Amino acid sequence: ERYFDRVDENNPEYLRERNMAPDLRQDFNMMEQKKRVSMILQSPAFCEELESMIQEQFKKGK
Amino acid sequence: HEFEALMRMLDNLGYRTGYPYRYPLVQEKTKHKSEVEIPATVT
Amino acid sequence: TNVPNVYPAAPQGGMAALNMSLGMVTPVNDLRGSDSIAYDKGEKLLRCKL
Amino acid sequence: DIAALVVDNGSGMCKAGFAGDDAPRAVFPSIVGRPRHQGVMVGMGQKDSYVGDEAQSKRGILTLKYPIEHGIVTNWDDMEKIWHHTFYNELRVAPEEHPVLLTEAPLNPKANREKMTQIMFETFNTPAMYVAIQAVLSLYASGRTTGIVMDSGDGVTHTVPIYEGYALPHAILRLDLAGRDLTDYLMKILTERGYSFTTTAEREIVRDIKEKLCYVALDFEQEMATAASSSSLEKSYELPDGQVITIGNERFRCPEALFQPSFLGMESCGIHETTFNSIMKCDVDIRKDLYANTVLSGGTTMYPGIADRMQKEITALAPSTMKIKIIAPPERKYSVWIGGSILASLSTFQQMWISKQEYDESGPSIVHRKC
Numbered sequence A: 001e002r003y004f005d006r007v008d009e010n011n012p013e014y015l016r017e018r019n020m021a022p023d024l025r026q027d028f029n030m031m032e033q034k035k036r037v038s039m040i041l042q043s044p045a046f047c048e049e050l051e052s053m054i055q056e057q058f059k060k061g062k
Numbered sequence B: 001h002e003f004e005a006l007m008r009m010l011d012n013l014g015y016r017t018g019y020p021y022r023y024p025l026v027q028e029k030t031k032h033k034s035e036v037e038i039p040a041t042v043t
Numbered sequence C: 001t002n003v004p005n006v007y008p009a010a011p012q013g014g015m016a017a018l019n020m021s022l023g024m025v026t027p028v029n030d031l032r033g034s035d036s037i038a039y040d041k042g043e044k045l046l047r048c049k050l
Numbered sequence D: 001d002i003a004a005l006v007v008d009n010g011s012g013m014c015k016a017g018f019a020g021d022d023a024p025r026a027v028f029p030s031i032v033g034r035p036r037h038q039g040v041m042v043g044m045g046q047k048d049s050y051v052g053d054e055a056q057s058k059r060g061i062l063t064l065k066y067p068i069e070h071g072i073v074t075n076w077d078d079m080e081k082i083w084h085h086t087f088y089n090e091l092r093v094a095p096e097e098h099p100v101l102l103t104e105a106p107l108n109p110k111a112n113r114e115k116m117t118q119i120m121f122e123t124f125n126t127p128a129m130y131v132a133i134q135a136v137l138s139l140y141a142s143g144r145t146t147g148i149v150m151d152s153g154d155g156v157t158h159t160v161p162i163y164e165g166y167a168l169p170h171a172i173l174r175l176d177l178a179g180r181d182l183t184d185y186l187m188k189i190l191t192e193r194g195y196s197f198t199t200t201a202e203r204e205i206v207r208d209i210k211e212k213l214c215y216v217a218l219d220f221e222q223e224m225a226t227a228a229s230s231s232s233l234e235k236s237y238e239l240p241d242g243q244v245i246t247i248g249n250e251r252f253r254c255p256e257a258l259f260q261p262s263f264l265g266m267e268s269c270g271i272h273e274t275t276f277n278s279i280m281k282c283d284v285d286i287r288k289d290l291y292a293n294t295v296l297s298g299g300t301t302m303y304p305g306i307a308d309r310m311q312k313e314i315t316a317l318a319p320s321t322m323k324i325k326i327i328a329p330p331e332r333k334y335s336v337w338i339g340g341s342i343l344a345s346l347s348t349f350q351q352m353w354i355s356k357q358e359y360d361e362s363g364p365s366i367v368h369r370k371c
């Protein structure tokens, strides 16, 4: 009995599994396979450049 | 090796010299090996 | 149609004027632009200083 | 651990997620549906209006309308409904506890930003909210700070060049040629095959057809010759009622309106010509980098073969000595949100947030002071 093992209405964040489009099913898996947001933050050389660029663009204007 | 650099100095400003360089020189933009950069789709 | 300008030279100071003309033609810091990401700030600073 | 929220809005798609996450938590169309048929069944579930993913399920009994067209909102109440559904039903988080990050088109009227800020502070009691440019965030998601970016959504197409983190306001080019107009053109050219679609649900069906069975031709005349002289370029779509249609010749005809707007009769030029003109408006010294870094963004640029045709058309107008390359990330649909997820995560960005208390003495114009 898999059907007794779990219930669709017990967990809403398991209920999200049923109502997915197939291309939406790939987009999440591929995008957390890539981990781009983790890559940008973990890599320093681009990171402090972005840091200081935002800070000193605030410094003179906007 | 000392003459080539002097003569390239002379060519840079506009002295239209006809001296043939034995060693050709190219300036190119530097290459990246950060993991952020994505390769281009085509050549 | 016009070559980059050359500053007139002293009889004993020709190559100083040569260097200053070349430096006004070619900037010593050309990494600014798309190559800023290629090198980190600490190494780019040393390259500029040297 | 209070984390910021990133909410990306575009005409036809709303995404939302916590800052610092790889994936947005909620993705759903920006649709509002109201019942059209006489509802007679006492005691079962009826509602005044359906919104979001639930509204798309019941397309048969609903009239579906979009609150945003061409990047400009038409009815603000529907926008409030979508924002409330995003904050409460999708993420189940209080809007007044976490800061929220918002995006918009670069060129837009004055009143949009002010009304958006007023609604976001007054209705939801947001302690801090910031407005950012979509295309700039897409370039940050690509991870290069320089280059010219092309973001083409379902509302409007725009190319902006960004040099050293600054987007030049004079060189920004905007063209009102989007995917919804392509859907309308595809419906008009499917009329002549014998299949007729008129209602809004049929427009969504046509949009799904366009997403599944469209591609960009490398040579337009040669592909017309091949499609006329052979039946190889024919695919069959299977309708939700069981009927089967043959898309046939039209597959490369609908996206080609992106390059030649003379099919739609628009006065403006093509998208590649728009990108080329935007590059021409910039300074000469940076043009090399503008030809060296070009990324594609938006769901409209997911047509197969868009990169090769774009590169060829840019190379045709470019000087012979220039080098042309086109960057197309596979996740170009959700790049903008990813950029937002970068921008809220920085340690220098906490001072960039708009203060709730400062808005009290400033007012709705405060964003024009700070952004």
Ligand SMILES: Nc1ncnc2c1ncn2[C@@H]1O[C@H](COP(=O)(O)OP(=O)(O)O)[C@@H](O)[C@H]1O
Binding pocket: D009, D010, D011, D012, D013, D152, D153, D154, D155, D179, D180, D207, D210, D211, D212, D298, D299, D300, D301, D302, D303, D333
């Ligand atoms: N897989 C796909 N292939 C081709 N076109 C697509 C695909 N997915 C979406 N589109 C087109 O892109 C549009 C959605 O663009 P979107 O990225 O949502 O714009 P925005 O987010 O700026 O509103 C849709 O109208 C659709 O026509």
